[PDB]
Design a protein around this ligand. Structure first.
Ligand SMILES: O=C1N=C(NS(=O)(=O)c2ccc3ccccc3c2)S/C1=C\c1ccccc1Oc1ccccc1
Length: 358
């Protein structure tokens, strides 16, 4: 209780989507996308008519709404560009210039897709993953074939390292009354896949003390038969001159009343070298990227948070919950080291954080 009033985080509510004319039935994974902190896109069928709604997070009181039919709609992370699909037909549309950009017809249905950069869409079929540039004439390019361990899964995420050399596909399945995560880590250079049991993950770049060059880290969290675990590992050849990053493995805690909770989302602060982990029940956890030390845990949402993105300005995490609350969490930069000193009583981490300068 000493200094218990000083949190290491700042929680913020940004929006309530039901106050912006969004039907609650459409606030969910199949109909609402948030590919970055810049936009939220919702598909709604008002009467017999399919509509696409775009909320510009910089102008949220003026949603853009159009009678456009699509099975899925994802805004570009940065520009006023949208990808739409209808069956096997994909199109990318330049909203700003009110013009079509690119189109492609697949032979296999796309069951999941996501923007992975300012200019590339990843496409997941039942049997493969493709990357499609929004520029130029190029067709999607196959990156890898799907591993059998993901067969029949609901795909929930796809993401890459910054250099697009380490690719990660995540799915879940219902095995009796358990939700089991299955990941496929693919190395572009080695042309090798590794199946991993995991629920949520991210990549990060991290410059170790004593090294001149960044390490590419892969962090994943799982709740399996052994309970909750978080792993932080370097992937790929360490830059010449670097020492290797020692792999970290730490517990992920669930209270006794939360036996059916599990990880659903992860984002990593570039600036603060902190991992944000969100659970199905609406808990957030913070871990130190370097050591895996658990900094903080709390239940921040009464409803499941079903989509997240980096929150750029604060190097935090932003998300939408099933009632339509748009919320974020970030490090509170002036309070985190007091909290580490006096509540965690971890002066090694207090020092290491100040030395990084944060
Ligand atoms: O009615 C329209 N209203 C618009 N306004 S907008 O550009 O600000 C805008 C705004 C929001 C959008 C959301 C999703 C997809 C496109 C959008 C475009 S463009 C248009 C028709 C149109 C124009 C050019 C070529 C074809 C057109 O028809 C379709 C376009 C995409 C999918 C299906 C049909």
């Amino acid at each position: 209780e000493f200094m218990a009033q000083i949190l290491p985080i700042r929680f913020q509510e940004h929006l309530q989507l039901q106050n912006l004319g969004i039907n609650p039935a459409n606030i969910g994974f199949s109909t609402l996308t948030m590919e970055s902190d810049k936009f939220i896109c919702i598909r709604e069928k008002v009467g017999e008519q399919a509509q696409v709604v775009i909320i510009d997070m910089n102008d949220p009181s003026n949603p853009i709404r159009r009678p456009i039919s699509a099975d899925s709609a994802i805004m570009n992370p940065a520009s006023k560009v949208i990808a739409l699909k209808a069956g096997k037909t994909l199109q990318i549309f330049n909203i700003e210039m009110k013009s079509k950009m690119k189109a492609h017809t697949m032979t296999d249905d796309v069951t999941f897709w996501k923007w992975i950069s300012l200019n590339t869409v990843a496409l997941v079929t039942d049997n493969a993953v493709y990357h499609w540039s929004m520029e130029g004439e190029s067709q999607p390019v196959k990156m890898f074939d799907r591993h059998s361990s993901l067969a029949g899964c609901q795909i929930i995420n796809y993401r890459t390292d910054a250099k697009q050399k380490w690719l990660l596909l995540t799915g879940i399945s219902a095995q009796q009354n358990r939700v089991v995560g299955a990941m496929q880590l693919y190395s572009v250079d080695r042309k090798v896949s590794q199946p991993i049991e995991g629920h949520a993950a991210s990549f990060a770049q991290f410059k170790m003390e004593g090294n001149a060059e960044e390490s590419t880290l892969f962090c994943f969290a799982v709740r399996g038969q052994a309970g909750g675990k978080l792993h932080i590992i370097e992937v790929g050849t360490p830059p010449t001159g670097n020492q290797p990053f020692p792999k970290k493995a730490v517990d992920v805690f669930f209270p006794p009343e939360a036996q059916n909770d599990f990880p659903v989302a992860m984002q990593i602060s570039e600036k603060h070298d902190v991992v944000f982990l969100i659970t199905k029940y609406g808990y957030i956890h913070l871990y130190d990227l370097e050591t895996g030390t658990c900094i903080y845990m709390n239940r921040i949402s009464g409803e499941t948070i079903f989509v997240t993105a980096p929150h750029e300005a604060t190097a935090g995490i932003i998300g939408v919950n099933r009632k339509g609350q748009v919320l974020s969490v970030c490090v509170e930069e002036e309070n985190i080291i007091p909290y580490i000193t006096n509540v965690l009583q971890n002066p090694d981490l207090a020092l290491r954080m100040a030395v990084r300068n944060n």
